[PDB]
Ligand binder design. Structure first.
Ligand SMILES: Oc1ccc(Br)cc1
Ligand SMILES: Oc1ccc(Br)cc1
Ligand SMILES: Oc1ccc(Br)cc1
Ligand SMILES: Oc1ccc(Br)cc1
Ligand SMILES: Oc1ccc(Br)cc1
Ligand SMILES: Oc1ccc(Br)cc1
Ligand SMILES: Oc1ccc(Br)cc1
Ligand SMILES: Oc1ccc(Br)cc1
Ligand SMILES: Oc1ccc(Br)cc1
Ligand SMILES: [Ca+2]
Ligand SMILES: [Ca+2]
Ligand SMILES: [Ca+2]
Ligand SMILES: [Ca+2]
Ligand SMILES: [Ca+2]
Ligand SMILES: [Ca+2]
Ligand SMILES: [Ca+2]
Ligand SMILES: [Ca+2]
Ligand SMILES: [Ca+2]
Ligand SMILES: [Ca+2]
Ligand SMILES: [Ca+2]
Ligand SMILES: [Ca+2]
Ligand SMILES: [Ca+2]
Ligand SMILES: [Ca+2]
Ligand SMILES: [Ca+2]
Ligand SMILES: [Ca+2]
Ligand SMILES: [Fe+3]
Ligand SMILES: [Fe+3]
Ligand SMILES: [Fe+3]
Ligand SMILES: [Fe+3]
Lengths: 81, 306, 491, 492, 304, 83
């Protein structure tokens, strides 16, 4: 249930491959993306990290899992505050 | 002593006599600044080689007028209107070339006509280029921009005729590959008796460096002889030998030639405002006519041989 | 069917023949032809790279004018004269006066080649050249004509070449030297290769883009259209140079290129250098005049010369140094003596412009800035007497432009003088003196404006007297500050 | 006596004839020739502007090589590898790896035209083009071969095109598309007009000048010499474009120019953008990458297209925006993932350099500067772990270069995706997706490095695994910071 | 698990081979990266049109070898040394033309020889341009860069011969303007019986797209025939017609042709390391020989 | 009576025609040149003004006149500050 997404983190300069888990919540997905961005090229911030479909106006709920979100492998997401 | 003055509606040199001049006057009139200073036509040492050339061959011409700049092309052509007119004429000729080719016209001319063309037509490229060279000389030496402009357009027309001739020499060679078309024109121009009057005429005319003598010899002697003794007799021979294309091509070229005659007649009329110029022009015509007459006679004997 | 041009083109230039009734030298005299003794046969090797023919020419050129004139007519009421920056209006005035009647003069340079070049291909391309420059002269008279009724300084689009005004004499002395006053082969080399291919091509491209930025779409379109004609006739000098080189005349070829490039440079620096660095609104400057020269003129010359088997001119070091300095002094002079110009020079020395100048030319403020400081203080104190001249500048006996140097904290000025046939001449550079020495008979008895003033030819011997001699006809025609000193308010 | 070239030249290109024993289409098949149905006779009007002949070619090119090799030999002792700025050495490594074997591949593009173009003049010029590119390929192997003994990274002058390293794949994907992968007329347009005349001519001129400034006269002379060959074969696309336009194919011609310029741009931005704005010492910078792109490259394209009666490509405004942004992010990526490059990228973000970047690109510090602040802070704290990557970037399915945007306080990143024949593709711009859609059969089943990683072709699925897959053979070969982080000392 | 390694003194691919790499090896060897991936020659879709072309006409050629890249030009020519050599030969040709022209050679050929030249010599420009096109095809398809380099130089040499022929056609026409020199060659190539064997041969050869067949047909069949049946017989007839220029010009061209033969024979030798290739090469020679024989017969009947 | 010289003043940008008098001392010449430069394009400053042949190392004595100096009409001079 390894699940590849392409993730763009807010204020970073690129989109990156991040392999998450089919059963990860959006919170868990955001932490996995954050690992490859925050304190690497993006300053740490207070507040809640949220996930969305790339350039969408709607956020996935924090405890929705990848499996139930409707996302498909290799689709692009943003992680934003 | 300097005062305030209102803007002028046209150029200061025209602003007394006009409010809104023609396009022609706006763009053509009084552009030879080189006639302003009789000691230094050009902004260089008064005795530079080109200043000496211009003082002798333009300023000191026996053809004398205190107002050359007032000459007006009777057609009042400018660059824009010339191209409109000639693009039309070239649409005409190029369409003729295309259509006659499609019919294989050249195949159907009378037996032997290809040898007459190779001998009497294709070497015209030399004659026409001489006219081109000569026209450009009158251009650069004439004492008014309005005269020079008529010469520019005449130079272009001469190149037009040279181009028609190159195109047709090649084309004709495709049907008659054994006639020497495109191969022997220089040797004919240099060596064939029928070309020698014309070649002597042009070599000598191209060394008449006085602007007035150049203009009279070229436009009042050479070119009218070419109309009467080359173009028209070639046209007649063509019809007689079942070449329908040549006569039509020549009528288009004769339209250019008639235009050259028109502006030349106008310049003569302007010059004759000074009655002294009558003897000068007549003198130069009498000087050059015998050479043009020999040239015509020799060409005509060659054209009509066999 | 029609036969393609390549199948018959050669016949259009098979026009050389061996003269029998006059001699070859009689038909092609050296002074007019410039063949340098190279026999007729050899000239038949001349090959113009970009071919065209009469019917193609009239067809395409007809379309070009249809466009140019229609655009002018459609923008008639766009109020360009009233709405443009004064800096742009002065650019137009300066361009039309310096160029319009020179383009027409270029018909004669082309005509010289059409009759007197020993190369048949040259004679034909020169014929198109006569036509092209006729177009350009007529366009550049017709277009500015519209503005005569608005502003007497636009009269100078026609008047300049008929005057003894300083810049008009500088232009005519140059153009008469490289266009109308030399043999056919010198024209090919000095006009078509050095001046047209080497300067005007890039200049016209830059000017058209500048016009568009200024919102003058009529001029932008005009200048663009004219520039499309350039290659047709400007191509003529390359093949001429190759021919001289092949025939043992490389030394003479090099010398003619060296002469023309330097003479073009001095004129270019006085008439266009100030436009780019001072007349153009600051916010619209994307390169300095030095950057333009270095990146669009110099390297191109070096590569083209090498390609032909020629070398950088001997003075290349001097040229590179001149690009840092010359036009800043030329501008200062044009502005200080603005009353003698037929356009209104923009000072271009607000603090913001001065910072840009300093960035583009480190040291500018401790040099030219020192002079502008005094001028600026006088302007603020309404000392109009101290920003108007009471004497003539000293003038180069070659370029007809004032003798200048570097001012301020790094003061350095050098006149290069010559005693020749009992007369003392002064030149603005080592190169200008050298040019004179290459062909003294071209130049030796010429009198610059100062020579004439000192010979009593200009009366009264006053500013008013000089302005009258220079052809000015009213107070409105005399050059003034482009912005009526509005820039001082930012100081 | 000898007769002037002008009098016999036409005979050297009077080589078209009407096939009788095979058909015209069999002799010039569309897929290899690209004639778009335009009949043989029409192509005979193709007229190369800069003519030359065999005797002149061998003579002048003999002189050129005598010089190039003599200069190389005479300067052997100058110790360029030891004495040059690290930035210059990385520029050499990057250049030779990306270019040398690509020059040799261009022999194949030229040969495609020599055999399959219906224009006789094109077939002859392409023959000289084959020879030119052969020269350039051999020169640019012979010269860097000298540095093999100094540094294994110079092995990549030969090795890159034989590897699956990311930049090598980006280069091969581009060059195989415009040079070796299409018909003769496409090559004329996309290689000689769009890439050579449009980019490399001015790039080589700039490079030769930069070389002299770096004190490397062997390389300055080499590049300058190579550039003097360019017009001889680069001139070929111009007349081909004219012919297509005259024969009702303006839109087909435009499309090919459109596609080629953008593809060249993306590669140009990753390989040369960072060199100009970051690797070159500050005191030797005379214009920014943007100024170069806008004034030299874009300016000459506009003038050249107009002269041909073509239009500015549809994406021109996108291009104008890209030149302000793209290469800054590309540089950041190349540096952060430096271990995957065969050269050593220079960070180029000391305070003085950042002041220059800010002057040339107002807002730079509030954008890329934000990322560099975090990186810089980590270097100053010896948090080396945080300046090394632990995943792959997402990669464009067209350019083969990572999907980037503008970072920091003006964050904007857009991926342009496509579902095509049951597969999901991602592109780094609207133009890149559009290129894909113009010719899907050229591109559809290609797998970029990430696609391969996800497909299981790269094992182990780790950094070491990717590095091995990319063809690295020792720890020295992997890219590092050009100055081993010396720059950080200037950042406080 | 990456090791530290020292710099190598040459390219990694040459570093093992005992011998020190020559200039030739350094700049010529193993440059076709397009042979690395069998299913995707080029870095595109594996089934792109050009990938399918190469998989079919190069990769799938019945002429087979595990190491084509190991082929070596017996003359070990690179661009630099090719131009040194050919500049010498072009200096020879230049002085030949210049000096023969000065002594008015062409005026002294036996009566009527100009007609034989117009019929049998000047249309050779079509034949030579066909060789040029064909050599360029072998270049772009050959499975090793060392093979391709020989082809590049052969392509240039073909253009060289085309250029000689154009120059001499024009030159001869200056003395003999009524022989159709520079005027009737396309028509002759298209319609004259003596040219039809050669034209059919080249039109067919130019559509042989398998790299192996293209090489065998061009270099082992067409080109040796041209040496034996065109170049040599033209020399013989020229001498008999007091044309001393043509045989000396052909001498320099024959030097090129012998070089082409040398590298071709070297490639056959290399190919024969795989004994299966003997029957394949032989098959292709026997297939193309009848067309070449017919071409030669028709040309020689025309010449005599 | 009138005597024309071409004069380059220290720190100015050009050479100018300045008409002086045969009987003008070099001090007087310096003042006549200064009139067209100082407070126009050149800042005023303390110091003795001296006259010299253009780019020469030798100065003319301050009280020496144009006539006495050996200068010829239209020759070029510099006006510079002492030492
Ligand atoms: O093409 C040109 C000729 C002469 C001048 Br002046 C300007 C342009
Ligand atoms: O407007 C111009 C003035 C002078 C030159 Br030189 C070129 C252009
Ligand atoms: O009128 C002038 C033009 C240029 C200079 Br410098 C000085 C005066
Ligand atoms: O007396 C004069 C003053 C200024 C000038 Br400019 C010319 C004469
Ligand atoms: O001329 C060139 C051809 C191909 C490349 Br890659 C670079 C330059
Ligand atoms: O040196 C170069 C590197 C990449 C490109 Br794309 C062009 C030139
Ligand atoms: O290796 C890389 C190259 C470019 C970018 Br952007 C990211 C990574
Ligand atoms: O697991 C991986 C880490 C870094 C890269 Br780059 C590739 C794979
Ligand atoms: O290949 C050639 C060499 C010399 C001459 Br002359 C002509 C052709
Ligand atoms: Ca007049
Ligand atoms: Ca008058
Ligand atoms: Ca006199
Ligand atoms: Ca009058
Ligand atoms: Ca018919
Ligand atoms: Ca015959
Ligand atoms: Ca012919
Ligand atoms: Ca008389
Ligand atoms: Ca039309
Ligand atoms: Ca006014
Ligand atoms: Ca488009
Ligand atoms: Ca390293
Ligand atoms: Ca497969
Ligand atoms: Ca011929
Ligand atoms: Ca006293
Ligand atoms: Ca005295
Ligand atoms: Fe012009
Ligand atoms: Fe021009
Ligand atoms: Fe190259
Ligand atoms: Fe190239």
């Amino acid at each position: 249930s390894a699940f590849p997404v392409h993730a763009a983190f807010e204020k970073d300069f690129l989109v990156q491959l991040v392999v998450v888990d089919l059963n990860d919540s959006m919170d868990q997905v955001a932490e996995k993306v954050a690992y490859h961005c925050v304190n690497r090229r993006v300053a740490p911030r207070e507040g809640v990290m949220r996930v969305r479909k790339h350039r969408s106006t709607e956020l996935f709920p924090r405890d929705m899992t990848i499996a139930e979100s409707g996302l498909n492998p290799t689709e692009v997401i943003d992680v934003v505050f | 002593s300097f005062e305030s003055k209102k803007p002028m509606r046209t150029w200061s040199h025209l602003a007394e006599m006009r409010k809104k001049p023609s396009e022609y006057d706006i763009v053509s009139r009084k552009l030879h600044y080189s006639t302003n200073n009789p000691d230094s036509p050009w902004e260089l040492s008064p005795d530079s080689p080109m200043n000496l050339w211009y003082k002798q061959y333009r300023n000191a011409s026996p053809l004398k007028h205190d107002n050359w700049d007032a000459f007006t092309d009777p057609d009042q052509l400018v660059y824009r209107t010339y191209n409109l007119m000639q693009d039309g004429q070239e649409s005409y000729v190029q369409s003729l070339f295309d259509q006659f080719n499609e019919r294989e016209h050249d195949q159907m001319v009378r037996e032997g006509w290809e040898h007459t063309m190779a001998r009497c037509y294709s070497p015209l490229r030399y004659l026409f280029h001489c006219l081109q060279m000569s026209s450009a000389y009158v251009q650069q030496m004439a004492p008014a921009s309005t005269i020079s402009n008529c010469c520019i357009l005449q130079t272009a027309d001469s190149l037009r005729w040279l181009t028609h001739t190159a195109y047709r020499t090649h084309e004709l060679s495709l049907t008659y590959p054994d006639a020497g078309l495109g191969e022997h024109e220089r040797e004919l121009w240099e060596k064939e008796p029928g070309w020698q009057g014309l070649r002597e005429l042009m070599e000598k005319q191209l060394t008449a460096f006085d602007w007035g003598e150049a203009f009279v010899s070229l436009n009042l002697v050479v070119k009218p002889m070419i109309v009467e003794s080359i173009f028209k007799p070639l046209q007649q021979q063509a019809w007689e030998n079942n070449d329908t294309l040549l006569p039509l091509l020549i009528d288009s070229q004769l339209k250019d030639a008639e235009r050259h005659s028109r502006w030349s007649k106008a310049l003569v009329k302007h010059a004759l405002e000074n009655p002294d110029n009558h003897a000068v022009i007549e003198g130069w015509i009498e000087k050059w006519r015998p050479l043009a007459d020999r040239a015509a006679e020799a060409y005509l004997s060659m054209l009509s041989s066999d | 069917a029609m036969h393609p041009r390549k199948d018959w083109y050669e016949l259009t230039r098979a026009t050389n023949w061996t003269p029998s009734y006059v001699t070859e030298e009689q038909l092609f005299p050296e002074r007019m032809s410039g063949h340098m003794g190279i026999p007729l046969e050899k000239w038949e090797s001349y090959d113009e790279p970009y071919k065209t023919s009469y019917p193609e020419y009239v067809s395409i050129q007809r379309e070009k004018d249809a466009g140019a004139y229609s655009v002018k007519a459609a923008l008639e009421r766009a109020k360009i004269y009233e709405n443009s920056d004064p800096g742009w209006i002065s650019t137009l005035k300066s361009h039309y006066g310096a160029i319009a009647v020179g383009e027409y003069a270029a018909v004669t340079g082309e005509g010289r080649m059409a009759r007197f070049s020993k190369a048949p291909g040259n004679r034909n391309m020169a014929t198109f050249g006569m036509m092209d420059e006729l177009r350009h002269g007529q366009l550049q008279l017709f277009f500015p004509h519209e503005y005569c009724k608005k502003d007497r300084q636009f009269d100078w689009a026609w008047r300049a070449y008929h005057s003894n005004e300083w810049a008009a004499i500088a232009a005519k002395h140059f153009f008469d030297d490289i266009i109308t006053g030399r043999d056919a082969i010198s024209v090919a080399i000095m006009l078509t290769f050095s001046f047209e291919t080497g300067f005007t091509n890039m200049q016209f491209l830059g000017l058209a883009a500048d016009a568009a930025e200024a919102g003058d779409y009529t001029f932008a379109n005009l200048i663009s259209s004219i520039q499309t004609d350039e290659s047709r006739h400007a191509q003529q000098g390359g093949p001429a140079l190759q021919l001289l080189i092949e025939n043992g005349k490389r030394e003479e070829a090099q010398k003619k290129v060296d002469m023309a490039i330097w003479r073009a440079w001095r004129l270019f620096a006085v008439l266009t250098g100030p436009v780019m660095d001072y007349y153009t609104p600051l916010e619209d400057r994307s390169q300095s005049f030095k950057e333009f020269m270095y990146e669009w003129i110099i390297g191109q010359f070096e590569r083209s010369l090498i390609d032909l088997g020629l070398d950088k001119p001997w003075y290349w070091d001097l040229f590179l140094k001149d690009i840092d300095e010359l036009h800043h002094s030329y501008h200062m002079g044009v502005w200080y003596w603005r009353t003698t110009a037929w356009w209104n020079p923009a000072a271009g020395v607000t603090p913001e412009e001065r910072d840009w100048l300093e960035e583009k030319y480190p040291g500018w403020n401790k040099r030219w800035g020192r002079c502008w400081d005094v001028i600026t203080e006088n302007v603020l104190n309404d000392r109009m007497d101290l920003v108007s001249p009471e004497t003539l500048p000293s003038v180069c006996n070659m370029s007809q432009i004032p003798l200048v140097g570097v001012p301020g904290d790094d003061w350095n000025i050098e006149v290069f003088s010559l005693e020749h046939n009992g007369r003392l001449y002064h030149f603005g550079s080592e190169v200008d003196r050298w040019v004179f020495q290459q062909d003294p008979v071209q130049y030796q008895n010429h009198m610059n404006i100062v020579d004439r003033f000192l010979a009593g030819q200009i009366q009264p011997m006053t500013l008013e007297g000089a302005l009258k001699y220079m052809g000015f006809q009213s107070i409105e025609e005399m050059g003034k500050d482009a912005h009526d000193f509005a820039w001082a308010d930012k100081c």
